[PDB]
């Protein structure tokens, strides 16, 4: 009854509508194990950044493999994962004072939500609101270890101490420091990545040691980007590493050199809807609205256009990429710029293909849900969050 109805209802890659975001669950599990084993080898916790998937069943797999808590990039993510049972949540974006009532309400409901700041003004806002509301917020100080984005300079002891004392004197819980070495995205050699992972570790530990030297607590030291989590040779002084895009990987990571195209677990299922035979084009229904506008591979060692073409079995078809994209139309052609002869027999109308993305975080956000592909060929819909 339940059985017979569910079979006659269950989808495969041939029955799905296109475009669709497909997770190869076997590749996803191998990626989750690889990262968790590496952090276990290092004796550090893994606090996965769920911004890559924003999907409960994906985070559940990461927790099942040994992850401790999660990092989120929005309070919407904190709300969704808290409602799904995660209590240990780091909101790793410089806290806006106007979001303080939502952060308070989450903590009041039982979410052990941590906030981050990098300025004396944001620390004063949190501490003043905490005092007025009788709430000892936990706050960590964000450190700039590579010049990329937010944070207090690791060697700026006077600002570190001013922010740490503002929090501690004001009765908040100064819980740690964190950094994200996002400049790792510019590198493409194991040497350079190892040296940057060492700078990220050294600088975040240096900031923790300056706070402690002044008598302030700083029990957590949190570092990480996917490339540096995979390349660090040593993590002395670090308590946890944050990494997110690893769960799926993507062609940017492939080009950085921390994975192979065959480790990429996310692909976009697409149908061939036409051709321009004289130009060697196949037109597919995955345009930039499916792939996203991310072109992070354009300035790396191999430009994959709007994505690398794979056959329906997920095997790369070398030399064919989406060379261009409009909103709902992707232009499939030879990467080397030749006109494929007979493109229409190589890619007949109605043929389905799988496109590996430049950037899994940007492609995944284009979809309300993923289709999680099991080894038997069946798919299940895994919702993910959109918006704020």
Ligand X SMILES: Cc1ncc(COP(=O)(O)O)c(CN[C@H](C(=O)O)[C@@H](O)C(=O)O)c1O
Nearer to Mg ion, 347 or 370 (CB): 370
Q: Assign residue 216 a region (left: φ > 0; alpha: ψ between -120 and 50; beta: otherwise).
A: beta
d(CA 244, CA 383): 18
Residue 94 CA, distance from chain mean position: 18
Q: Which part of the chain contacts its own copies (CB under 8 A), choosing from 26-34, 126-134, 356-364, 371-379? A: 356-364
Residue 275 engages its own copies in binding (rule: CB under 8 A)? yes
Quick check: helix, strand or coil at residue 174? strand
d(CA 42, CA 227): 15
Residue carrying the six token digits 């030291």: 221
Residues 78-137 that bind its own copies (CB under 8 A): 93-99, 102, 117-119, 121-122, 125
Residue 360 engages its own copies in binding (rule: CB under 8 A)? no
Of the residues 24, 146, 250, 285, which one makes contact with its own copies according to CB under 8 A: 285
Of the residues 49, 54, 107, 384, which one makes contact with ligand X according to CB under 6 A: 49
First to last CA, the chain: 40
Residue 388 engages ligand X in binding (rule: CB under 6 A)? no
Residue 369 engages its own copies in binding (rule: CB under 8 A)? yes
Q: Which part of the chain contacts its own copies (CB under 8 A), choosing from 3-11, 62-70, 82-90, 345-353? A: 345-353
Q: Which part of the chain contacts Mg ion (CB under 5 A), choosing from 96-104, 165-173, 284-292, 354-362? A: 354-362
Q: How far is CA 228 from CA 189, 338, 349, in A?
A: 12, 37, 43
Of the residues 361, 372, 379, 385, which one makes contact with Mg ion according to CB under 5 A: 361
Residue carrying the six token digits 């409009």: 326
Of the residues 89, 92, 208, 343, which one makes contact with ligand X according to CB under 6 A: 92
Helices (H) and strands (E) in the chain, counts: 13, 18
Q: Which part of the chain contacts Mg ion (CB under 5 A), choosing from 31-39, 116-124, 206-214, 357-365? A: 357-365
d(CA 317, CA 303): 15
The phi, psi pair for 68, rounded to 5°, reads: -115, 105
Nearest to 265 by CA among 369, 157, 371: 371
Of the residues 131, 149, 301, 315, which one makes contact with its own copies according to CB under 8 A: 149
Q: How far is CA 215 from CA 102, 218, 340, 345, in A?
A: 31, 9, 68, 72
Residues that bind its own copies (CB under 8 A): 17-20, 51, 73-74, 93-99, 102, 117-119, 121-122, 125, 144, 149-150, 182, 271, 273-276, 283, 285, 288-289, 292-295, 326-329, 331, 348-350, 359, 361-362, 365-369, 386-388
> For binding to ligand X (CB under 6 A), which residues are involved?
49, 71, 92, 180, 182, 185, 224-226, 242-246, 326-327, 361
């Amino acid at each position: 009854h339940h059985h017979h109805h569910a079979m006659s209802m269950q989808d495969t890659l041939l029955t799905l509508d296109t475009p669709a975001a497909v997770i190869d669950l076997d590749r996803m599990q191998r990626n989750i194990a690889r990262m968790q084993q590496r952090m276990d080898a290092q004796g550090v916790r893994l606090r996965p950044h769920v911004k890559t998937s924003k999907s409960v069943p994906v985070a559940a797999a990461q927790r099942a493999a040994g992850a401790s808590g999660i990092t989120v990039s929005t309070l919407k993510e904190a709300e969704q994962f808290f409602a799904a049972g995660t209590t240990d949540i780091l909101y790793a974006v410089s806290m806006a004072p106007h979001r303080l009532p939502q952060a308070l309400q989450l903590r009041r409901r039982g979410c052990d939500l941590k906030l981050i700041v990098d300025s004396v003004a944001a620390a004063q806002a949190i501490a003043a609101f905490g005092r007025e509301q009788g709430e000892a917020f936990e706050v960590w100080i964000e450190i700039d270890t590579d010049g990329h984005r937010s944070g207090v300079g690791a060697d700026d002891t006077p600002l570190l101490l001013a922010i740490g004392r503002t929090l501690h004197d004001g009765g908040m819980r100064l819980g740690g420091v964190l950094t994200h070495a996002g400049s790792s995205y510019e590198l493409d050699t194991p040497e350079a990545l190892q040296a940057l992972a060492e700078r990220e570790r050294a600088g975040c530990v240096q900031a923790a040691e300056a706070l402690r030297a002044a008598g302030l607590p700083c029990p957590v030291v949190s570092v990480g980007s996917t490339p540096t989590a995979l390349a660090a040779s040593r993590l002395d002084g670090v308590t946890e590493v944050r990494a997110g895009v690893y769960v799926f990987f993507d062609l940017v990571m492939r080009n950085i050199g921390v994975c192979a195209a065959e480790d990429v677990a996310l692909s976009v299922l697409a149908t061939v809807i036409g051709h321009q035979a004289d130009k060697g084009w196949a037109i597919v229904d995955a345009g930039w609205m499916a792939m996203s506008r991310d072109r992070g591979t354009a300035r790396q060692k191999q430009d994959f256009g709007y994505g690398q073409v794979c056959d329906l079995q997920g095997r790369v078809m070398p030399g064919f990429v989406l060379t261009g994209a409009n909103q709902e139309h992707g232009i499939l052609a030879r990467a080397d710029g030749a006109a494929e002869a007979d493109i229409a027999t190589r890619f007949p109308l109605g043929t389905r293909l799988r496109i590996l993305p430049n950037a899994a975080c940007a492609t995944g956000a284009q979809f309300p849900a993923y289709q999680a592909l099991a080894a038997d060929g069946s798919v299940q819909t895994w919702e993910r969050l959109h918006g704020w």
